[PDB]
Amino acid sequence: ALKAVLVDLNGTLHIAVPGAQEALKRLRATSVMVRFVTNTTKETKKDLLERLKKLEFEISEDEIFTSLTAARNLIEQKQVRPMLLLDDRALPEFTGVQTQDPNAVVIGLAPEHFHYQLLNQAFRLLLDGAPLIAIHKARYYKRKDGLALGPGPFVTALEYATDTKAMVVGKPEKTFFLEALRDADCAPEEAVMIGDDCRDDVDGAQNIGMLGILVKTGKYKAADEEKINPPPYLTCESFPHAVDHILQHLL
Ligand SMILES: [Mg+2]
After folding, report:
1. Ligand 1 ion: nearby residues, β-carbon < 5 Å
2. Is the N or the C terminus of the chain less surrounded, counting Cβ atoms within 10 Å?
């Protein structure tokens, strides 16, 4: 009955977690589809794959899925020409997407685009009926010189200005999981997500009816499992442990 396993790529697989590359080879001995997922506004599948190959994982490219892929999929489903308020680094993920005469607004973390004039242009697309698509809505992030504005304040500004709500496509939001699961052509109920983040990874997956496994690596702190309802289907020490459980109980 288990058809797909989604695996967070950051803190679940490396900080390389010991046993991970072996545990994954073991998971592959089954027929389960394996997907490697992350929220990102900046990173390509090619870079992420690279980083994983360095670390001795056997992962192919068609297996990495991100916040950006979710946005490309939605773009292609809605058949819209987005204005891409994205870092120049994300744009390889949108090659072949039409952006001229735009009729949609896609917004990630794009400081160089996060100025009045270009924001006002986006505003006028939304007044005209353009859908607003947000990669995610984080208030801030940490950089070399301290906390800095993330994409969330700027999504909200556009939302405030137009009295509309963005479709958010990054974790914990439902779209991230449904698009990740799209290539397995399976129900969320027939999949599991493994992450070190009880909210973004595990609660997010379980809100659409996936089984969520919280691992005590990466950004996990003791009693994180207690902050969500219901609790994670399973909380365990690491990715190799998650995997043994899956082999035992779910396959
Ligand atoms: Mg992570």
Report:
1. 8, 10-11
2. N
